[PDB]
Curated annotation (Swiss-Prot):
Organism expressing this protein natively: Homo sapiens (Human)
Full protein name: Cytoplasmic dynein 1 heavy chain 1
Modified sites of kind N6-acetyllysine: 10
Task of the protein: Cytoplasmic dynein 1 acts as a motor for the intracellular retrograde motility of vesicles and organelles along microtubules. Dynein has ATPase activity; the force-producing power stroke is thought to occur on release of ADP. Plays a role in mitotic spindle assembly and metaphase plate congression.
Localization per record: Cytoplasm, Cytoskeleton
Name of the coding gene: DYNC1H1
Disease: Charcot-Marie-Tooth disease, axonal, type 2O: An axonal form of Charcot-Marie-Tooth disease, a disorder of the peripheral nervous system, characterized by progressive weakness and atrophy, initially of the peroneal muscles and later of the distal muscles of the arms. Charcot-Marie-Tooth disease is classified in two main groups on the basis of electrophysiologic properties and histopathology: primary peripheral demyelinating neuropathies (designated CMT1 when they are dominantly inherited) and primary peripheral axonal neuropathies (CMT2).
Notes concerning its domains: Dynein heavy chains probably consist of an N-terminal stem (which binds cargo and interacts with other dynein components), and the head or motor domain. The motor contains six tandemly-linked AAA domains in the head, which form a ring. A stalk-like structure (formed by two of the coiled coil domains) protrudes between AAA 4 and AAA 5 and terminates in a microtubule-binding site. A seventh domain may also contribute to this ring; it is not clear whether the N-terminus or the C-terminus forms this extra domain.
Amino acid sequence: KVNRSTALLKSLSAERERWEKTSETFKNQMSTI
């Protein structure tokens, strides 16, 4: 279904943004360990 495809597309784009934020947080934690 097209609606399901669009919903999962926007959800996975949000996941991409969240997980690149997680990656940069992981890079930040190296400075403090």
